[PDB]
C-alpha cells in the first residue's frame, strides 16, 4: 500500500464488462484501482530507462583559439590567402584595413586582411538519441492488502515490479495470494522518442525536443567524429574584432554553460549517469483484473478484541488509515470494519483496503477507509469488546466535486487527449471525447507551439475579448470558450 | 589611472556542504545551523510526509 | 497533552557589538564582516561625506 502518503494519488473505480480498465500511469503520480470483487491495487511508474543511446550531435560550449595567423593584401589587389583558410580546424575572417606608404603598400585605400585561429573544444554537450524500441518502463504493483512489512521474506513488501518494453508490452504480475494482474501497456505512445534528444551536458542531462537541439547556435560535430577536427558553426563561439580598421583579432566567446542552462529552462531534467533514467514519463496501460481475486474471502469474521496500535490518521486524499491488532481466537479471520453514524443505523463510509483480514494474531493490519464528510464513527470488531472510534472530515461534497473537476482538467492539460484513457472502460462517450480532444489538441499544438505562458495568457485574453464583443452568439460563445481554455492552459503550463 | 573597484560579480560558483532538514506536517519549519551563516544558500519547501 | 512548539517569538531583546563601516561617496557600499552573520542585525544608509 505505497500509494498512501503521496499527494498525487488518484483513484480508479470500476472495470468494464470484460474486467479491464484503462489507466494512464505517471512518474510523480500514483494510481489506486478498486473493483467490486477485486482487491484494491496500487500502480506506480517508478523507472523509465532508455537503453543503447546513440549520439547524433556534439555541441561545443567552451571553445579555445590557439594559433592565430594573419595575411594582408595591398589595396586593389583583392583578398589575401592563408593556407589555414581551407583547413577545417581553423576559423577565418576577411576584412579591410587602411593601407598606405606608412603601412608599406604604395597605394592609398582599403587592403584586404585575413586572420585565422585554430578552434579547439574544451567542453562539449552530447545530444544523444534513443530508439523507441529501447525504452523499458518499470512499474510496481502492490496489492493494497493491509499487511505489514516482513523481514524474513525475500521481498519485504508484497509489491511486485514488472518491466514493460515496447516489444514485450503485455505482462502479468503474480501477486501472491491475490491471483494475477495483467498489464496491456502501450509504450510507443507514452513519449515520442523520435522527436526527443537526451542532452547530457557536464554532469547533468535533460530531455529536450530534437528540432530545438538541432537549431542551437553552437559549434557542433556530427557525433561520429572521434577526432573532433571539423567543428561546424565555429563562428557562433568566436568574435572577430576590427576597431578603427587598423588590425583584426579573433577571440573565443566564453564558456556557454550558463547560457545553455538558461536555454534549458522548460526542459525536464533526466538522469544520464549509470543508465538513461527518465523520471518524467507517463505510460498508458489496459489493466485486466479477470484473474485477480480477493484473499481470504472464504474466512469467518473475527470474534475477538482489536486494539489500535497506530492512531487513526487522515491522508491527504480524504481517507483515513488506522492500524489495528487482533487478540482473538480465530487465527485467520475477516476483520469487521464499518463506518456508521453515531446510532450505527446507517453505513456512511466505504472501505479502501477491501476485505481486511488478520492472517497472523501478533501481526497488525492497517486499514485505509474513506469516511463521509462530517462526523462518522469507525467501528472495529464485534460487540463483546468492540472498539468504536469517532472521526470528523473537514471538507464538503461540493468542495470535493470542485477539486475532482480541477484534477480532471489538470490531467487533461498535462496528458492532453490521453486523459480520456486514464479511467476509461470503453464506451461511446469516451471515444467521442477522445477523438474531439485529439482534433482540438492537434489544432492547439499547431497554433501554440513554442510560445511562453505569458504569451498564452495574452492570446487568451485577446480571444476572450473578441468573443465577448461578437455579433454572432455562436461565434461569441465559441471564442469565449477558446479564450477561457487557453487562459487556463497558460496558467497551468510550464511546470 | 588608479581605478577603485566598485563591485565584484560572481560568474562561476560552486555549491558544497549540502544539508537538509525536515519537519512533520503542521509543525512549522525545520532549522539548519547553516541558515545562520550567510554564505550558505538555503531554501524552504514542502514535501509530502 | 504533549504539545509541540510551533514557533518562538522574541519580546525582550538586546543589542551588543555595534560596528559600522563607511564608504566614500560614489564608491559603492560599505562592507562589514558581521554582515555575514544572521544573528547580527544590519542596515544600509547614506550619510553626508
Amino acid at each position: 500500500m505505497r500509494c498512501i502518503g503521496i499527494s498525487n494519488r488518484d483513484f480508479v473505480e470500476g472495470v468494464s464488462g470484460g474486467s479491464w480498465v484503462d489507466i494512464v500511469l505517471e512518474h510523480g503520480s500514483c494510481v489506486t484501482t478498486m473493483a467490486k470483487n477485486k482487491p484494491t491495487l496500487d500502480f506506480e511508474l517508478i523507472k523509465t530507462e532508455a537503453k543503447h543511446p546513440a549520439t547524433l550531435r556534439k555541441y561545443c560550449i567552451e571553445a579555445k583559439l590557439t594559433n592565430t595567423t594573419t595575411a594582408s593584401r595591398c589595396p586593389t589587389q583583392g583578398e589575401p590567402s592563408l593556407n589555414e583558410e581551407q583547413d577545417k580546424r581553423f576559423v577565418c575572417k576577411h576584412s579591410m584595413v587602411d593601407r598606405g606608404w606608412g603601412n608599406g603598400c604604395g597605394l592609398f585605400g582599403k587592403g584586404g586582411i585575413v586572420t585565422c585561429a585554430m578552434f579547439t573544444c574544451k567542453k562539449n554537450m552530447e545530444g544523444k538519441i534513443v530508439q523507441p524500441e529501447n525504452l523499458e518502463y518499470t512499474i510496481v504493483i502492490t496489492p493494497h492488502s493491509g499487511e505489514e512489512n516482513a523481514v524474513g521474506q525475500d521481498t519485504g513488501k508484497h509489491g511486485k515490479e514488472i518491466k514493460v518494453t515496447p516489444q514485450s508490452s503485455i505482462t502479468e504480475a503474480e501477486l501472491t495470494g491475490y491471483g494475477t494482474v495483467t498489464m496491456e501497456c502501450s509504450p510507443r505512445t507514452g513519449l515520442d522518442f523520435n522527436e526527443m534528444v537526451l542532452l547530457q551536458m557536464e554532469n547533468k542531462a535533460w530531455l529536450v525536443h530534437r528540432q530545438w537541439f538541432l537549431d542551437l547556435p553552437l559549434p557542433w560535430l556530427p557525433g561520429a567524429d572521434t577526432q573532433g577536427s571539423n567543428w561546424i558553426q565555429k563562428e557562433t563561439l568566436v568574435t572577430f574584432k576590427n576597431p578603427h580598421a587598423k588590425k583584426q583579432d579573433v577571440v573565443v566567446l566564453g564558456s556557454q554553460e550558463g547560457a545553455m542552462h538558461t536555454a534549458l529552462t522548460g526542459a525536464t531534467e533526466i538522469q544520464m549517469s549509470s543508465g538513461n533514467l527518465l523520471f518524467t514519463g507517463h505510460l498508458k496501460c489496459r489493466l485486466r483484473m479477470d484473474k485477480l481475486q480477493l484473499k481470504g474471502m472464504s474466512y469467518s469474521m473475527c470474534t475477538g478484541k482489536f486494539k489500535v496500535v497506530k492512531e487513526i490518521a487522515e491522508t491527504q486524499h480524504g481517507t483515513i488509515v488506522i492500524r489495528v491488532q487482533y487478540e482473538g481466537d480465530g487465527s485467520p479471520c475477516k476483520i469487521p470494519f464499518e463506518i456508521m453514524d453515531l446510532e450505527k443505523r446507517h453505513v456512511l463510509g466505504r472501505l479502501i483496503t477491501v476485505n481486511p483480514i488478520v492472517t497472523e494474531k501478533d501481526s497488525p493490519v492497517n486499514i485505509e477507509a474513506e469516511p463521509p464528510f462530517g462526523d462518522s464513527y469507525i467501528i472495529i470488531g464485534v460487540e463483546p469488546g468492540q472498539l468504536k472510534l469517532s472521526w470528523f472530515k473537514k471538507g464538503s461534497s461540493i468542495g470535493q466535486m470542485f477539486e475532482t473537476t480541477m484534477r480532471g482538467a489538470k490531467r487533461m492539460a498535462i496528458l492532453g487527449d490521453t486523459a480520456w484513457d486514464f479511467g476509461s472502460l470503453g464506451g461511446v462517450f469516451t471515444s467521442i471525447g477522445k477523438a474531439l480532444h485529439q482534433v482540438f489538441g492537434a489544432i492547439y499544438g499547431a497554433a501554440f507551439s513554442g510560445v511562453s505562458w505569458t504569451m498564452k495568457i495574452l492570446i487568451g485574453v485577446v480571444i476572450t475579448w473578441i468573443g465577448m464583443n461578437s455579433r454572432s452568439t455562436s461565434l461569441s460563445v465559441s471564442l469565449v470558450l477558446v479564450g477561457v481554455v487557453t487562459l487556463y492552459l497558460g496558467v497551468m503550463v510550464q511546470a | 589611472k588608479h581605478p577603485a573597484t566598485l563591485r565584484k560579480y560572481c560568474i562561476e560558483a560552486k555549491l558544497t556542504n549540502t544539508t537538509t532538514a525536515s519537519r512533520c506536517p503542521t509543525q512549522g519549519e525545520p532549522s539548519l545551523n547553516e541558515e545562520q551563516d550567510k554564505r550558505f544558500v538555503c531554501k524552504h519547501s514542502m514535501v509530502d510526509r | 497533552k504533549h504539545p509541540a512548539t510551533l514557533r518562538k517569538y522574541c519580546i525582550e531583546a538586546k543589542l551588543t557589538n555595534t560596528t559600522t563601516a563607511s564608504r566614500c561617496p560614489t564608491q559603492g557600499e560599505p562592507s562589514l564582516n558581521e554582515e555575514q552573520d544572521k544573528r547580527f542585525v544590519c542596515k544600509h544608509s547614506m550619510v553626508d561625506r
Partner: antibody
Amino acid sequence: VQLVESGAEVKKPGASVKVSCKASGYTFTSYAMHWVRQAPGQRLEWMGWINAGNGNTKYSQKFQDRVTITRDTSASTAYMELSSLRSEDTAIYYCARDKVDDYGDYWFPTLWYFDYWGQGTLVTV
Amino acid sequence: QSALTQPASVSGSPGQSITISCTGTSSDVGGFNYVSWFQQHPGKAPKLMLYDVTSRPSGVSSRFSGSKSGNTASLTISGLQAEDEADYYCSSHTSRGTWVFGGGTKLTVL
C-alpha cells in the same frame, strides 16, 4: 542477507585504518550502507552512510573530517576509512544497511533501518 | 540532535514486565516515528527488536512492545525470559538526517 566485515585490526595512534563490509544475499546497489561504532563498554555511535546506488554519503559531524566511506559496486563491498586515528577510536565497528527509495536517492530512511548488521570489526590503538 | 537518554541499568524478576525509557528532543524522538530499539548481547552485533516506535521485525517475539509519548519512547518486555538479558539501545533518525543512539540499558532479569 548477510553482511561480512574484515578481520580485527590493531593500529598505532595517528595511523589510518580502513575496514570493509561485504553485502551478500541482496542487491548491493539498492541499499545504503551505514557505519556504526561502539567503544568497549560504551553506547553505539552512528558515523555515516554510503548510498551504494550512486556513492552519495553523509557523515556524522563527529567524523566529518576523518571518516571516509566508499563503495565497490562490482565487489559489493563498502569501505570505512578512519584516518588520523587516536586512543579513543578503539571500538568495534559495525555495518548496517537501509534500503534507498525507488530512485536510489536515499534521503528518507525506511522505518526498519539497520535491520541487518555485520558481526563488527574491532580496531585497537 | 544528541545522544538519547536511557537508564544505565534495568532489572526485573522472570515473568514480570520491564519498561525502558528513551528520552529525546523535538527532533530525535518527539518529532518523528523513527524510534527503533536494538538488543545487543555481549560480544555480538545489535539486533533490531522494534522499529516505527511499536513495530517489530518478523522474527521478533510478541513480548516486545514499544510506546512513544511526547519526547519519550518506551520499550516494555512482558515475559522477561533469561534470554531477554542484554543491552538495549534506542535510536532515532533526527530531523537533520542523522542517527542518534541512546546510551543503552542492561536487563539483569534475576
